[PDB]
Design a protein around this ligand. Structure first.
Ligand SMILES: *C(=O)N1C[C@H](NOS(=O)(=O)O)CC[C@H]1C(N)=O
Length: 261
């Protein structure tokens, strides 16, 4: 109840809409704030897409090594890794790593194309028991984050359960799960978000996202020192389209969640 009140006060002082889902896998206890409201996933959807290609690699041995042609025309709005390889090639493993750890949008589009389009990512979500996730568009338009728009959205509760199944459960094979966790732990973009609200001694693997309407997201699997892991989804979006990012709000939500643990 105190956590519910503090998250409501944080949201009230934030000027936006905050969604939080915590799963404590020590006892499966949950904490939800707007946990069943939809939020635009933005770059956090990349987790699903990479996991889906990892799932494909369970029945294609050499799929993650398969070269993919990077063309000049493939570049979109944020391609910090892919631009080095245009007119060249990247493997699907490199593309997955670039998408997850550097949030390369061209790499995400290559992952999406490897799955047959956004519906293939949604189909993977359905195949691992996620009924809420929907991916509808490619990069960059999946980040429009328009209020009330269900496209490219999920709920905090669904994303927390799914992230647990992908990183801690058995939605993926053991090697694929380990690769996904390795990728998440090497994220370069997460230090200002959930991780900033957690004690420094805790290991975090996470994927951030941001979009229009000041949309500021983070999804994390957290290994606290000396405790079983947590799954924490913090989604945040604001009323006006041009709003600035608010990673401090994600950090504050993580601090509130962390303090009740
Ligand atoms: C995903 O949210 N995006 C791709 C890339 N990464 O964002 S993050 O660094 O906040 O994870 C650029 C921002 C954003 C986008 N432009 O769509």
């Amino acid at each position: 109840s105190a956590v519910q009140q503090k998250l409501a006060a944080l949201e009230k002082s934030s000027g936006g809409r905050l969604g939080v889902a915590l799963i404590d896998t020590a006892d499966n206890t949950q904490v939800l704030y707007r946990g069943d409201e939809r939020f635009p996933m933005c770059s956090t959807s990349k987790v699903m897409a990479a996991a889906a290609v990892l799932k494909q690699s369970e029945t294609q041995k050499q799929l993650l090594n398969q070269p993919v042609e990077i063309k000049p025309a493939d570049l979109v709005n944020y391609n910090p890794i892919a631009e080095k390889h245009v007119n060249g090639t990247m493997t699907l493993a490199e593309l997955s790593a670039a998408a997850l750890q550097y949030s390369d949008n061209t790499a995400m589009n290559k992952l999406i194309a490897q799955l047959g389009g956004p519906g293939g990512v949604t189909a993977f979500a359905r195949a691992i028991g996620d009924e809420t996730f929907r991916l509808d568009r490619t990069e960059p338009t999946l980040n429009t984050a328009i209020p009330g728009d269900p496209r490219d959205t999920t709920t905090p509760r669904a994303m927390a359960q799914t992230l647990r199944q992908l990183t801690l459960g058995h939605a993926l094979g053991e090697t694929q799960r380990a690769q996904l966790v390795t990728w998440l732990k090497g994220n370069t973009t997460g230090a200002a978000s959930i991780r900033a609200g957690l004690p420094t001694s805790w290991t975090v693997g996470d994927k951030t996202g941001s979009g229009d309407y000041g949309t500021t997201n983070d999804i994390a699997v957290i290994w606290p020192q000396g405790r079983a892991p947590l799954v924490l989804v913090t989604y945040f979006t604001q009323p006006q389209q041009n709003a600035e990012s608010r990673r401090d709000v994600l950090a504050s939500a993580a601090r509130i969640i962390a303090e009740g643990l």
